[PDB]
Design an enzyme around this catalytic site. Structure first.
Site, short mmCIF file in Angstrom:
data_model
loop_
_atom_site.label_atom_id
_atom_site.label_comp_id
_atom_site.label_asym_id
_atom_site.label_seq_id
_atom_site.Cartn_x
_atom_site.Cartn_y
_atom_site.Cartn_z
N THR A 38 16.08 -45.53 34.44
CA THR A 38 17.01 -46.64 34.76
C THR A 38 16.82 -47.83 33.82
O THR A 38 17.76 -48.11 33.07
CB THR A 38 16.93 -47.08 36.22
OG1 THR A 38 15.63 -47.62 36.43
CG2 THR A 38 17.22 -45.95 37.18
N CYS A 72 18.61 -51.05 45.68
CA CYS A 72 17.41 -50.81 44.84
C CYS A 72 16.24 -51.75 45.22
O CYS A 72 16.34 -52.96 45.05
CB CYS A 72 17.76 -51.03 43.37
SG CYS A 72 16.44 -50.61 42.21
N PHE A 92 23.11 -52.25 41.57
CA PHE A 92 21.87 -51.88 42.31
C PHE A 92 22.22 -51.30 43.70
O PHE A 92 21.33 -51.26 44.58
CB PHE A 92 20.93 -53.10 42.39
CG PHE A 92 20.33 -53.52 41.07
CD1 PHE A 92 19.34 -52.76 40.45
CD2 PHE A 92 20.76 -54.66 40.43
CE1 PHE A 92 18.78 -53.16 39.24
CE2 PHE A 92 20.21 -55.05 39.21
CZ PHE A 92 19.23 -54.29 38.62
C1 HEM Z 1 17.91 -51.39 35.75
C2 HEM Z 1 17.13 -50.73 36.57
C3 HEM Z 1 17.67 -50.08 37.79
C4 HEM Z 1 18.96 -49.83 38.27
C5 HEM Z 1 20.28 -50.09 37.58
C6 HEM Z 1 18.81 -49.23 39.55
C7 HEM Z 1 19.87 -48.83 40.39
C8 HEM Z 1 19.70 -48.36 41.69
C9 HEM Z 1 20.72 -48.01 42.59
C10 HEM Z 1 22.21 -48.05 42.31
C11 HEM Z 1 20.12 -47.61 43.77
C12 HEM Z 1 20.79 -47.13 45.04
C13 HEM Z 1 20.96 -45.59 45.05
C14 HEM Z 1 21.86 -45.05 46.17
O1 HEM Z 1 22.53 -45.81 46.99
O2 HEM Z 1 21.91 -43.79 46.25
C15 HEM Z 1 18.73 -47.72 43.59
C16 HEM Z 1 17.81 -47.38 44.58
C17 HEM Z 1 16.44 -47.40 44.35
N1 HEM Z 1 15.83 -47.76 43.21
FE1 HEM Z 1 16.67 -48.39 41.59
N2 HEM Z 1 17.50 -49.13 39.82
C18 HEM Z 1 16.76 -49.61 38.83
C19 HEM Z 1 15.36 -49.74 38.69
C20 HEM Z 1 14.42 -49.32 39.59
C21 HEM Z 1 13.03 -49.31 39.40
C22 HEM Z 1 12.24 -49.84 38.20
C23 HEM Z 1 12.51 -48.80 40.59
C24 HEM Z 1 11.11 -48.51 40.97
C25 HEM Z 1 10.05 -48.58 40.16
C26 HEM Z 1 13.61 -48.45 41.40
C27 HEM Z 1 13.47 -47.89 42.63
C28 HEM Z 1 14.54 -47.60 43.46
C29 HEM Z 1 14.27 -47.15 44.82
C30 HEM Z 1 12.93 -46.86 45.46
C31 HEM Z 1 15.47 -47.00 45.38
C32 HEM Z 1 15.74 -46.53 46.81
C33 HEM Z 1 15.72 -47.78 47.70
C34 HEM Z 1 16.00 -47.51 49.17
O3 HEM Z 1 17.04 -46.95 49.55
O4 HEM Z 1 15.18 -47.92 50.03
N3 HEM Z 1 14.77 -48.77 40.79
N4 HEM Z 1 18.49 -48.16 42.30
#
Ligand code: HEM
Ligand SMILES: CCCCCCCCCC(=O)N[C@H]1CCOC1=O
Length: 455
Positions: free
Chosen positions: A268, A400, A393
């Site tokens: 990501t 996220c 996000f």
């Molecule tokens: C530019 C960086 C990032 C973008 C654009 C991004 C985007 C997203 C998006 C769109 C989701 C929601 C997914 C869904 O509804 O199915 C999400 C969930 C998540 N992201 Fe990211 N993400 C990024 C960076 C990170 C990083 C660095 C981490 C962890 C080290 C991370 C951990 C997670 C986690 C754990 C979730 C699930 C959260 C939950 O539902 O409780 N993300 N991310």
């Protein structure tokens, strides 16, 4: 008026399925969205997905009292190695709410003050890499950014150094993680998943799952034995108690969280940074503005936390890169009850939806006529953005957890890139978008000319 929703071109009894037989499926779905508009239904033998592209409809779908996070076919296949980690768990699963409550203070803006020194360690490694390149050499942007972001989550997650910049040949964890993500993302396009022409893929996937499990279980076991209290997500998860249930995370769910994190770091924030640098070298007016800010703010050899917070325009550059190419391009939802979308589209309990974030971010009614223009100035007033218009996000309690982490790292690294080097698009690069779990520019090369500022 209740209306029938449009549907793209069918293939006999396979319906829409063969439209997934591409390595650029988001891009194809964006092209389908351009043709059919704010909503179309996509039918396979197994399932139906409704694709949403308008603010009007997506703001309804982002109503948490009406819709909840769904696991697409892809996330359901990712779950085979990410298990009930925060990313692949359902909201109503006990382990989502447990991990959510335990980890949320680990991912707060305040917590970034702790991760700062370790983010800077890897940032300086990149800067020094690029300082030492010879004059007749170029930078492989997504390649080096994926090196930086992987290493960042290694160090912050569980105090482990992948040493990505010290090898061409990937870490065995990462070969398996990348091959499992590939297989997960390719499974849903197979008309007959159970053909013997996928038995080798099935064998290799099981092996890759086992490889990932073995190596993270060892990390968890080594940490439990040492009693070592490093300020990383693993200590936090080992000492963690859910205030609701009173329960800690079991070792297996910690394994899933580490696997989840290592996927997020590799896929990501690397894509965000690569797409930021692309839009800068293609908009040198914007590059010059970003670079002046970097130069004026980053007055010390090593950026402070406070100094990263002050990189407003770099922050604006990042948001405008996330608008045009949200590196995580999609999130799925399901109807919690029977209901009607936009007073036009009847839905049944359990009906699956997919938000194409790249199309939401092109909504001319929200962003005006200059929608394909790269203008960070769109975000200059942060409070002018309508509700549910910008979702790089995701949405609500399933947004996220790493959003503060990703934007800190991104701002830090882009700041230092812009302070230490000028960038030339020497080859006149033509955007080619490789899709894994995430969107990255494929083949993006630049030359960095050193500004000779010591570290
Ligand atoms: C530019 C960086 C990032 C973008 C654009 C991004 C985007 C997203 C998006 C769109 C989701 C929601 C997914 C869904 O509804 O199915 C999400 C969930 C998540 N992201 Fe990211 N993400 C990024 C960076 C990170 C990083 C660095 C981490 C962890 C080290 C991370 C951990 C997670 C986690 C754990 C979730 C699930 C959260 C939950 O539902 O409780 N993300 N991310
Ligand atoms: C958060 C990054 C991952 C983005 C979600 C992955 C899905 C994007 C494209 C899509 O709709 N594919 C369908 C095909 C059937 O089931 C899916 O999954």
């Amino acid at each position: 008026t209740i209306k029938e929703m449009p549907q793209p071109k069918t293939f006999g009894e396979l319906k829409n399925l063969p439209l997934l037989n591409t390595d650029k499926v988001v891009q194809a779905l964006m092209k389908i969205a351009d043709e059919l508009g704010e909503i179309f239904k996509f039918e396979a033998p197994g399932w139906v997905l409704r694709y949403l592209s308008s603010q009007r409809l997506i703001k309804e779908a982002c109503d948490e009292s009406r819709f909840d996070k769904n696991l697409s076919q892809v996330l359901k296949f990712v779950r085979d190695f990410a298990g009930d980690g925060l990313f692949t768990s359902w909201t109503h699963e006990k382990n989502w709410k447990k991990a959510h409550n335990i980890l949320l203070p680990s991912f707060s803006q305040q917590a970034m003050k702790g991760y700062h020194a370790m983010m800077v360690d890897i940032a300086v490694q990149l800067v020094q890499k690029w300082e030492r390149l010879n004059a007749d050499e170029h930078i492989e942007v997504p390649e080096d950014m994926t090196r930086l972001t992987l290493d960042t989550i290694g160090l912050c997650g569980f105090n482990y150094r992948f040493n990505s910049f010290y090898r061409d040949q990937p870490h065995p964890f990462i070969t398996s993680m990348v091959r499992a993500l590939d297989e997960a993302m390719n499974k849903p396009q197979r008309a007959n998943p159970d053909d013997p022409a996928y038995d080798e893929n099935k064998r290799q996937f099981q092996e890759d799952i086992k490889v990932m499990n073995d190596l993270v279980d060892k990390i968890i076991a080594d940490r439990k034995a040492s009693g070592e209290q490093s300020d990383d997500l693993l200590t936090h998860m080992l000492n963690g108690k859910d205030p609701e249930t009173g329960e800690p995370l079991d070792d297996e769910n910690i394994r899933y969280q580490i696997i989840t994190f290592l996927i997020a770091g590799h896929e990501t924030t690397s894509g965000l940074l690569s797409f930021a640098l692309y839009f800068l070298v293609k908009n040198p007016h914007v590059l010059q503005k970003a670079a002046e800010e970097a130069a004026r703010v980053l007055v010390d050899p090593v950026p402070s936390y406070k100094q990263v917070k002050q990189l407003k325009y770099v922050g604006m550059v990042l948001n405008e890169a996330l608008r045009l190419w949200p590196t995580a391009p999609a999130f799925s939802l399901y109807a919690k009850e029977d209901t009607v979308l936009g007073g036009e589209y009847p839905l049944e309990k359990g009906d699956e939806l997919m938000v194409l974030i790249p199309q939401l971010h092109r909504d001319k009614t929200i962003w005006g006529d200059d929608v394909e223009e790269f203008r960070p100035e769109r975000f200059e007033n942060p409070s002018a953005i309508p509700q549910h218009a910008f979702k790089p996000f995701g949405n609500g309690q399933r947004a996220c957890i790493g959003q503060q982490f990703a934007l800190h790292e991104a701002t830090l690294v882009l700041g230092m890139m812009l302070k230490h080097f000028d960038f030339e698009d020497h080859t006149n690069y033509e955007l080619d978008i490789k899709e894994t779990l995430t969107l990255k520019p494929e083949g993006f090369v630049v030359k960095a000319k050193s500004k000779k500022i010591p570290l």
